[PDB]
Enzyme design. Structure first.
Site, PDB file in Angstrom:
ATOM      1  CG  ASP A 252      67.002  76.203 -57.618  1.00 25.20           C
ATOM      2  OD1 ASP A 252      67.088  76.763 -55.842  1.00 25.20           O
ATOM      3  OD2 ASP A 252      66.577  74.794 -57.609  1.00 25.20           O
TER       4      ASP A 252
ATOM      5  CD  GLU B 190      72.671  71.484 -59.898  1.00 23.54           C
ATOM      6  OE1 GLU B 190      71.729  72.590 -59.959  1.00 23.54           O
ATOM      7  OE2 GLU B 190      72.730  71.199 -58.423  1.00 23.54           O
TER       8      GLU B 190
ATOM      9  CG  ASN C  50      62.897  75.815 -56.059  1.00 23.20           C
ATOM     10  OD1 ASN C  50      63.133  73.816 -56.830  1.00 23.20           O
ATOM     11  ND2 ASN C  50      63.950  76.048 -55.954  1.00 23.20           N
TER      12      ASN C  50
ATOM     13  CB  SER D 241      63.063  79.200 -52.654  1.00 21.17           C
ATOM     14  OG  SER D 241      63.110  78.037 -53.180  1.00 21.17           O
TER      15      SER D 241
ATOM     16  CG  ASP E 299      60.607  76.394 -51.485  1.00 21.25           C
ATOM     17  OD1 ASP E 299      60.529  76.602 -52.377  1.00 21.25           O
ATOM     18  OD2 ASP E 299      61.640  75.463 -51.567  1.00 21.25           O
TER      19      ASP E 299
ATOM     20  CG  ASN F 281      66.770  77.705 -52.831  1.00 20.63           C
ATOM     21  OD1 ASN F 281      66.002  78.086 -52.038  1.00 20.63           O
ATOM     22  ND2 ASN F 281      66.249  76.938 -53.592  1.00 20.63           N
TER      23      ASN F 281
END
EC number: 3.2.1.17
Length: 129
Positions: free
Chosen positions: A52, A35, A46, A50, A48, A59
């Site tokens: 991480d 990750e 991201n 958002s 959208d 998130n």
């Protein structure tokens, strides 16, 4: 901060992740590796809107507040910046809520793609736990 493999394993074990919800320590170390490659400062934006955050790439749309994610919820009650600290306490406690959210470790896509069903015990090799 960039954790050594066993160094992180030790830190996670200390925070009660070994076998938490039935997931061996190797699973968590493996998830962290893919990750964020053990980098507490890791961030991924991201499409959208958002982002991480941290060693476990939590998130912002649902778990932490970064003040720039539409209709974001802050179920872990913390600023996303707290997830970028050298102390993984924040990320671990939040992670404990995520893995209990109805999908097991499947919540972490890297874990699913690179760890699930593998010999995760190898991630703890050489570690004096």
């Amino acid at each position: 901060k960039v954790f050594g493999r066993c160094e992180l394993a030790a830190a996670m074990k200390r925070h009660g992740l070994d076998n938490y919800r039935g997931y061996s320590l190797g699973n968590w170390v493996c998830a962290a590796k893919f990750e964020s490659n053990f980098n507490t400062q890791a961030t991924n934006r991201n499409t959208d809107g958002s982002t991480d955050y941290g060693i476990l790439q939590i998130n912002s749309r649902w778990w932490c507040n970064d003040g720039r994610t539409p209709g974001s919820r802050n179920l872990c009650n913390i600023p996303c910046s707290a997830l970028l600290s050298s102390d993984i306490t924040a990320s671990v406690n939040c992670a404990k809520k995520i893995v209990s959210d109805g999908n097991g470790m499947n919540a972490w896509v890297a874990w699913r793609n690179r760890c699930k069903g593998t010999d995760v015990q190898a991630w703890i090799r050489g570690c004096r736990l």
